[PDB]
Amino acid sequence: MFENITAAPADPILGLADLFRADERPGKINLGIGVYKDETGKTPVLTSVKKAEQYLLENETTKNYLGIDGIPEFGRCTQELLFGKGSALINDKRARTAQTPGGTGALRVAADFLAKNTSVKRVWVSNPSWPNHKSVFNSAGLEVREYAYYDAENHTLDFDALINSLNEAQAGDVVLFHGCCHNPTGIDPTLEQWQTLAQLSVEKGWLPLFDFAYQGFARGLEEDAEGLRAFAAMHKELIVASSYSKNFGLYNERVGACTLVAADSETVDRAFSQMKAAIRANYSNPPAHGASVVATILSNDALRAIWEQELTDMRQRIQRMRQLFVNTLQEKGANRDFSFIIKQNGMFSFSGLTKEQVLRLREEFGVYAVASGRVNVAGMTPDNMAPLCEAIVAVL
Amino acid sequence: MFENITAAPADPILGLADLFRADERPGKINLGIGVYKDETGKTPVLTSVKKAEQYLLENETTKNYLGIDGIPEFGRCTQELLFGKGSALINDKRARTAQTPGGTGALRVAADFLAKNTSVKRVWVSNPSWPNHKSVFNSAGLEVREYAYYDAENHTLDFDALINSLNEAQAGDVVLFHGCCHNPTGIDPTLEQWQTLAQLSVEKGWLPLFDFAYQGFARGLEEDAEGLRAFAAMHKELIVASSYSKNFGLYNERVGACTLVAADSETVDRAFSQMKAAIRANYSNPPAHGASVVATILSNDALRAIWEQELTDMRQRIQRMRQLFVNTLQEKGANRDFSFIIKQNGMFSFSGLTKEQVLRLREEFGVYAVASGRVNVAGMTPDNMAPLCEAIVAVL
Ligand SMILES: *Cc1c(COP(=O)(O)O)c[n+]([O-])c(C)c1O
Ligand SMILES: *Cc1c(COP(=O)(O)O)c[n+]([O-])c(C)c1O
């Protein structure tokens, strides 16, 4: 059966982690995967989630199966985080959310749903985008086409080319938007550019799929959800795939949500029974621990307060690391002006490094960046900033 | 987009849980889903897993992403539990296991793998089988055909009809076997019947997919893995989907494994990179907590000892509940002889109840059984045994 199965290519993000760790050069720098690191090079489990975990350890009586859609508490808090407390879609009972294994699991459940219950043949995804978007949507059967997005010379969002790109998208096509902290560019629409796109998918008939992995990392939790809320005020139907792996530092527990919105509660609940039938045919019901923790933290005035401060410290430490990196690069001999990365949002810096600058950096300096030139700024600390900038300016 | 989406039918196992709980009749009995209950009507979280959880709470430093295939420790213990310590496939490095969200997630990953990397068009599944088998394999693209299995008059495995059924299976087809505690019948092959099937899939060219949800519940952990080990000694390629939701009482954390075996380590690792590419395109990497606990318990001499006793108490309490149920039924006026359910293995009793005996029992006595007449014996306690038997004999 398995004799002529070819070996798959390694994952462009995760394949790095395999190589990094097998390397026994002592001064290597990771900058690959997109996990926060603190000033000391470590990804601690947050304190708000250690208190919540002690709590579940004292207060759980059963591990008996969650419903197909998970913890209801988790569901309404996620909807409030996305749409706002007292939003009109919450009140009209227009949204239905399923707890999922991370944002990837929410993105696939969406894809599986749409493939067997919808007309959609095409998902539109930005150029550039998360590398695994294409792989999740092709596995469901859907075709992935690309729209323009980043102007590389000017280091801006190329809004016009994004508009003219999408004029080849039909009514009935999915268009994926990153909510904030665009992965990989970190370049996001202004509010004014999002209400322009809000209005345009309304007369073009696109179904919006918002991907939210980094809410809380660009300006703040509410500030980051504005673009989606500009679409939500206008659209009868949306879907958002949300992840709490980054903002909760809960990466390996796999906590996310696929939230469905239709024109009214009857349609949304009818559509939701199919989405739940897709979830059953894949894994059965979602992993409890991680979602259990999000919901304990968001249900507690005190424990929520502590998380929101932990998330603000991260937002700020990455911002500090950005200015540091453009300053250090400067005085380390930097051949170009890298000041544009200051204006980018989130964990990443989309540097202009070529695939070979990036290959040379791993294979002789041991600093790991994705082959697109995406480097994780949250993986930089004041101790490794100098090694790292000396490596980039010797490859320039 | 979602206007003419029809509502899905409710799940035959999980849809029960929705109805049970919405019912506010005080004496209702659940008997539906296949979760263990102790003498007091409760599914406690085991003590071996509460000690292991205290431990992770004291000893974890990060929630940073697991590899696509999860915890390696989890992987080798699962292989040892399935194949035996010092098995030849472990030593020849012939097996590769990925940690998954429960046994359902392992069964889908298998299906996704085989669909894009194999010739297989057909998975053969028993009649009767777990209701969701068909749904997981059809979602991957595969067709599901059925083979004969249970003789309902005699209450036996109908081995001949199982043989003649499968003579319509081609070389290259998947045939799914339940390892032990057949869901729904609880009727399993003898060892002699399994080495006969072991030999027959070898000259017929079937790929064996073993489903293991209840290892430790029929005779014991090693005793229960004998059939699979009879196939493993003969086959160059197998796949087993394993779950630790039942034997670890870890239902909602979602801990299982998809373990791949090929003729040699090169092929198995080549095939495994594709299986890992399927896992990435669905959820990304597995939920850590539940697998983390299995591996702490199995890595500890003491904590393992405590689990194995907890699993023996369950095995025994269900056996006690079986004799009780056939005894009580007898003296409650039982119209037929139900002594055959004594000879069945696992949590379930495949009673001969018709869909209408089963509908009448929920809708007027409030005892919930699956529409196949599958009743969960682990949901019976000495306090609810009499209500329950009075209900069955009034519907007979
Ligand atoms: C991190 C990330 C994901 C994956 O989320 P998780 O499954 O790890 O939670 C998905 N998408 O799409 C983007 C853009 C991410 O940055
Ligand atoms: C319980 C059970 C499953 C599902 O396993 P989990 O995902 O809940 O662990 C799958 N199969 O196939 C059978 C027979 C089961 O009894």
Q: A114 CA distance to ligand 1 centroid (A)? A: 20
For A131, the 3-state DSSP assignment is coil
Amino acid code (one letter) for A100: T
Q: Which is nearest to B176 in space by CA: B120, B97, B100?
A: B120
**Which atom, in ligand 2's list, is nearest to the CA of B243?**
9
- Alpha carbon distance B82, B215 (integer Å): 9
Using N-to-C axis directions, what is the helix angle for B133-140 and A265-280, rounded to 10°?
A: 90
Contact A65, A285 (CB under 8 A): yes
Q: Is A374 annotated as a binding residue?
A: yes
For residue B45, the chain A residues in CB contact (below 8 A) are 60-63
Strands (E), A265-383: 348-350, 374-376
For residue B49, the chain A residues in CB contact (below 8 A) are 63
Q: A243 CA distance to ligand 1 centroid (A)? A: 7
Amino acid code (one letter) for A173: D
Q: Give ligand 2 pocket residues (Cβ under 6 A).
A: A 284; B 34, 102-104, 130, 178, 183, 211, 213, 243, 245, 256
The DSSP string of A92-128 is: TT-EEEEEESHHHHHHHHHHHHHHHHS---EEEEESS
Contact A112, A131 (CB under 8 A): no
Q: Tell the residue number behind the tokens 């055959």, with chain if given.
A: B340
| Closest A-chain CA to B250 | A63
Using N-to-C axis directions, what is the helix angle for A102-117 and A133-140, rounded to 10°?
A: 30
Looking at the DSSP bridge assignments, the partners of residue A374 are: A350
- Alpha carbon distance B169, B136 (integer Å): 20
Closest approach of B396 to chain A, Cα-based (Å): 32
Pairs from B166-170 (Cβ < 8 Å, separation ≥ 24): B166/B124, B166/B200, B166/B204, B166/B206, B169/B122, B169/B124, B169/B145, B169/B204, B169/B206, B170/B122, B170/B205
Closest approach of A262 to chain B, Cα-based (Å): 7
| Superfamily of segment(s) A11-44+316-396 | Aspartate Aminotransferase, domain 1 (3.90.1150.10)
Contact A232, A262 (CB under 8 A): no
For residue A102, the chain B residues in CB contact (below 8 A) are 283-285
- Alpha carbon distance B316, B305 (integer Å): 17
Asked if A273 lies within 8 A of B61 by C-beta distance, the reply is no
Q: Which two tokens stand for residue B4?
A: 């003419």
| Closest B-chain CA to A268 | B2
Question: Which residue of A18, A135, A267 is in closest CB contact with B3?
Answer: A267
Q: Is B130 annotated as a binding residue?
A: yes
String of b and e for A31-54 (b: at least 16 CB within 10 Å)?
A: bbbbbbbeeeeebbbbebbebbbe
CA atoms in the 13 A half-sphere facing the CB of B359: 3
Contact A90, A220 (CB under 8 A): no
- Alpha carbon distance A323, A319 (integer Å): 7
Question: Which residue of A237, A273, A283 is in closest CB contact with B104?
Answer: A283
DSSP annotation of A264 reads S
Q: Is B45-315 in CATH node 3.40.640.10?
A: yes
- Alpha carbon distance B327, B322 (integer Å): 9
- Alpha carbon distance A144, A123 (integer Å): 5
Q: Which is nearest to B275 in space by CA: A369, A1, A134?
A: A1
- Alpha carbon distance B253, A287 (integer Å): 4
Question: Quick one: which H or E segment has residue A355?
Answer: helix A355-360
- Alpha carbon distance A108, A256 (integer Å): 12
For residue B286, the chain A residues in CB contact (below 8 A) are 101, 254
Q: Which is nearest to B184 in space by CA: B385, B22, B391, B369?
A: B369
Contacts A–B by Cβ distance under 8 A: 250
Asked if B252 lies within 8 A of A3 by C-beta distance, the reply is no
Contact B378, B350 (CB under 8 A): no
Which ligand sits closest to the CA of B135? 2
- Alpha carbon distance B316, B349 (integer Å): 15
Q: Which two tokens stand for residue A123?
A: 């998902």
Burial tier of B88 (Cβ tally within 10 Å: 0-12, 13-18, 19+): exposed
Q: How many CB atoms lie within 10 A of CB B15?
A: 16
Burial tier of B91 (Cβ tally within 10 Å: 0-12, 13-18, 19+): exposed
Looking at the DSSP bridge assignments, the partners of residue B157 are: B150
Question: Which residue of B62, B108, B136 is in closest CB contact with A43?
Answer: B62
- Determine the distance from the C-alpha atom of residue B221 to the mean position of all C-alpha atoms in its chain, rounded to a whole number: 14
Q: Whose CA is nearest to atom 15 of ligand 1?
A: A213
Q: Which is nearest to A221 in space by CA: A182, A179, A268, A278?
A: A179
Rg of chain B, C-alpha, whole Å: 21
DSSP annotation of A63 reads -
- Determine the distance from the C-alpha atom of residue B211 to the mean position of all C-alpha atoms in its chain, rounded to a whole number: 6
Per DSSP, helices labelled H in chain B are: 14-22, 47-59, 72-83, 88-91, 102-117, 133-140, 159-166, 191-204, 226-232, 265-280, 288-298, 301-331, 355-360, 385-393
For B7, the 3-state DSSP assignment is coil
Pairing of strands A150-151, A156-157: antiparallel
Closest approach of B324 to chain A, Cα-based (Å): 25
Sheet containing B238-243, strands listed edge to edge, beginning at the edge strand earlier in sequence? B95-100, B256-261, B238-243, B207-212, B174-178, B122-126, B143-147
Which ligand sits closest to the CA of A215? 1
CA distances (Å), B198 to each of A121, B226, B318, in order?
43, 11, 30
CA distances (Å), A348 to each of A19, A31, A32, A141, B63, in order?
20, 9, 10, 30, 20
Q: Is B34 annotated as a binding residue?
A: yes
Q: Give ligand 1 pocket residues (Cβ under 6 A).
A: A 34, 102-104, 130, 178, 183, 211, 213, 243, 245, 256; B 284
Interface probe, candidates A58, A252, A294, chain B, greatest B C-beta count within 10 A: A252
Q: Is B307 annotated as a binding residue?
A: no
- Alpha carbon distance A225, A248 (integer Å): 17
For residue A35, the chain B residues in CB contact (below 8 A) are 64-65
- Alpha carbon distance A180, A177 (integer Å): 9
Map out the domains of chain B as residue ranges: 11-44+316-396, 45-315
Question: Which residue of B7, B270, B280 is in closest CB contact with A5?
Answer: B270
Q: Which is nearest to A78 in space by CA: A234, A228, A259, A213?
A: A259
- Alpha carbon distance B76, B97 (integer Å): 8
Contact A372, A184 (CB under 8 A): yes
Asked if B7 lies within 8 A of A67 by C-beta distance, the reply is no
